[PDB]
Structures are given as C-alpha cells and as structure tokens.
RNA sequence: GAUUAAGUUAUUAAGGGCGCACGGUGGAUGCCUUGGCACUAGAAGCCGAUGAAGGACGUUACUAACGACGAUAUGCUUUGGG
C-alpha cells in the first residue's frame, strides 16, 4: 500500500512532495485535454499519495 | 290492373328519437406504502473570538441537480468489529 512504506526521512517528505505534486499530477492532467483515455486511473493514486505525505508531516509537526 | 270516374290505405329518411352491441378520451372506486400525526419509558437540553447557526463558490475519468466532503477536497492517518 503507503500508509506505512512512508516514516523513510524527514527531508525527503518535501522533496518528494514536490516531485509527486508537480511534476506527476501536472502531467497527468495536461495529458488529459490533448486526448488520452489510456490510464485515467492514475490520476486518483497519484492524489492520494499526496494525502499520505502531507500528513505525516503531521506527526514530525 | 285500370278503359274512364268515385273512394281508401301504403313505401320514402337529407336527418332525428328509444333499445342493444362495440370503441376512445377521462382518472372515481378497490387493493397496497416509502410519508405523516398522536403519545409511553430511558437518555439529553447547549455551540460561539481556538471564529458559531446558516450559507455562496468549489471537489469524480466524462458532471445538470440533491448527497457526503474542503486546494490533504466523491476523501487522508491510526486503534477495534467484520
């Protein structure tokens, strides 16, 4: 799953923050309006992998 | 079936009336319940400057409205049932 792979660095939270954020979900939704219906299932996983590293960041507070 | 007069009683149905048969529109009655109303027993009777009650705008792969949700947005973490 994700849910605990996570608990890995501390500074390596934001700087995969960051990779996953931008340079992912920013692709996959470009992607989207010039046409492709190939993996139109990326785009949840990719969003809930945000959720679970901006809440971990949470318990390091 | 006339040859002449005299005398009678009919048939018609453009359409209407009564009876019967067969059709349409119309949604009464019959049979049901997702919703109500009236009340007994146990809880319970407060939230708001740490920003409330109510809201507008947003969120799905494609979203017009209600539902649940808030840039971590059709959900995320953890402890238990299943």
């Known amino acids: 799953m994700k849910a605990k792979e996570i608990r890995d ?5 934001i700087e995969e923050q960051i990779k996953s954020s931008k340079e992912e979900l920013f692709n996959l939704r470009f992607q989207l309006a010039t046409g492709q219906l190939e993996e139109t299932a990326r785009i949840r996983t990719v969003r809930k992998t945000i959720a679970r590293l901006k809440t971990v960041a949470r318990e390091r507070e």
């Open 9 to 13: 660095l501390t500074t390596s939270e």
